[PDB]
C-alpha cells in the first residue's frame, strides 16, 4: 500500500479545472516524479468515473519510450493519485510560445515521435482524443513524452467507433463536431493541428468564442505561409482534411499512411522508437528540482471501494 506520506511535495507543475500536477520526491528512493491529484467528489458529481478509471488502465497497460510511464497509482478517502515519470523539459507549448515557430526539421523530429506513440496506442486499441501542445512534454533528454490519458478510449480496434463529445475545443476534429459517432482518425487531425502550430506559428483555426471556433473548424479552409515547403503543405493539408475517410491516416492502414508521407522520407522509423536520433534541443536543467521549463503562473503557487477497483497499481520497473 502506497500512502500520501511516502512523498515530499515540492512545487506545482500544472493546474487544471479538474486536477493538479505536483513535483514530488519519494522519501525511500530519493527519485523525483510528477503526481497528478484528482478529487473524488468532483469526479463523482460530474459523472466522470469511467474516464478516470480508463486513464489509470491506459497508464497501467502501456509501455512506450514516448508515453509517460506510471510508477504508482493509489487512492485515499477523498483523492485519486497518479505517480508518473517527471518530464523535466516542460510542455511543447512552453517552448513553442517562447520560440514562436520551429524549423521544419525540428517539427519533423517531434512529429515522428508523436506518430510512433500514436501508432503504438492504436495497436493497443486505444484512441487518445486529446493531442495538444499542453499534453506533449519533453523529457530530460529532449524526447517527446505524451501525458494526460484522461480522455482515452479502450477497445477501439480497426474501424471501431466512439460517441463521447470530448477533447479540447481548438483541437476538435470536424467529425466530432457532427452528430453520432467517430473513428480513430481524430488523433491524426490532432497531430495535424500541433504540426501546423509548430511550423506556422499559430493554430489553423481560432476565435475566443466556441460557437465561432466550431464554425471555422467545420467550414473554413486552411491557409499556408508561402515559404512553407511543398512536403509540409502536403502533410498539413492531408492531416487537416475535414473528411476523416480522406484524411492522412484515416484509411484502413492508419499510421502507415502518415509514416509513408514524403514529409517523413528522411525518417527511419526503427531509429525513432529506439531513441537513436539526436534531439534538436536538450533541456538545460541543472537539477531534478529545476522547473525553469514550466510557467511561473504554476510554480510560484503555494501548495498547502468497488467504484475505483481497477485504479490501484505498483510498477514492475
Amino acid at each position: 500500500k502506497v500512502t500520501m506520506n511516502d512523498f515530499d511535495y515540492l512545487k506545482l507543475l500544472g493546474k487544471g479545472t479538474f486536477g493538479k500536477v505536483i513535483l514530488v520526491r519519494e522519501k525511500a528512493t530519493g527519485r523525483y516524479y510528477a503526481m497528478k491529484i484528482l478529487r473524488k467528489e468532483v469526479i463523482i458529481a460530474k459523472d466522470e468515473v469511467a474516464h478516470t478509471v480508463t486513464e489509470s488502465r491506459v497508464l497501467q497497460n502501456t509501455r512506450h519510450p514516448f508515453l509517460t510511464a506510471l510508477k504508482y497509482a493509489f487512492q485515499t478517502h477523498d483523492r485519486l493519485c497518479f505517480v508518473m515519470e517527471y518530464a523535466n523539459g516542460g510542455e511543447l507549448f512552453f517552448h513553442l510560445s517562447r520560440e514562436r515557430v520551429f524549423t521544419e526539421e525540428r517539427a519533423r523530429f517531434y512529429g515522428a515521435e508523436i506518430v510512433s506513440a500514436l501508432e503504438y496506442l492504436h495497436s493497443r486499441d486505444v484512441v487518445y482524443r486529446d493531442i495538444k501542445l499542453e499534453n506533449l512534454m519533453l523529457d530530460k533528454d529532449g524526447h517527446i513524452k505524451i501525458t494526460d490519458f484522461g480522455l482515452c478510449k479502450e477497445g477501439i480496434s480497426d474501424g471501431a467507433t466512439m460517441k463521447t463529445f470530448c477533447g479540447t475545443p481548438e483541437y476538435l476534429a470536424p467529425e466530432v463536431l457532427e452528430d453520432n459517432d467517430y473513428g480513430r482518425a481524430v488523433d491524426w487531425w490532432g497531430l495535424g493541428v500541433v504540426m501546423y502550430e509548430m511550423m506556422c506559428g499559430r493554430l489553423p483555426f481560432y476565435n475566443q468564442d466556441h460557437e465561432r471556433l466550431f464554425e471555422l473548424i467545420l467550414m473554413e479552409e486552411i491557409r499556408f505561409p508561402r515559404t512553407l515547403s511543398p512536403e509540409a503543405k502536403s502533410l498539413l493539408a492531408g492531416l487537416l482534411k475535414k473528411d476523416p475517410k480522406q484524411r492522412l491516416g484515416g484509411g484502413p492502414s492508419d499510421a502507415k499512411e502518415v509514416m509513408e508521407h514524403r514529409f517523413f522520407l528522411s525518417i527511419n522509423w526503427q531509429d525513432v522508437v529506439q531513441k537513436k536520433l539526436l534531439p534538436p534541443f536538450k533541456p538545460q536543467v541543472t537539477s531534478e528540482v529545476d522547473t525553469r521549463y514550466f510557467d511561473d503562473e504554476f510554480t510560484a503557487q503555494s501548495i498547502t471501494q468497488e467504484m475505483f477497483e481497477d485504479f490501484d497499481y505498483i510498477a514492475d520497473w
Binding site: G16, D148, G150, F165, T168, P169, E170, Y206
Partner: peptide
C-alpha cells in the same frame, strides 16, 4: 499569443 486550452467531456 494563444492562451492555455482546457479539455471537456459532455
Amino acid at each position: 499569443g494563444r492562451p492555455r486550452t482546457t479539455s471537456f467531456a459532455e
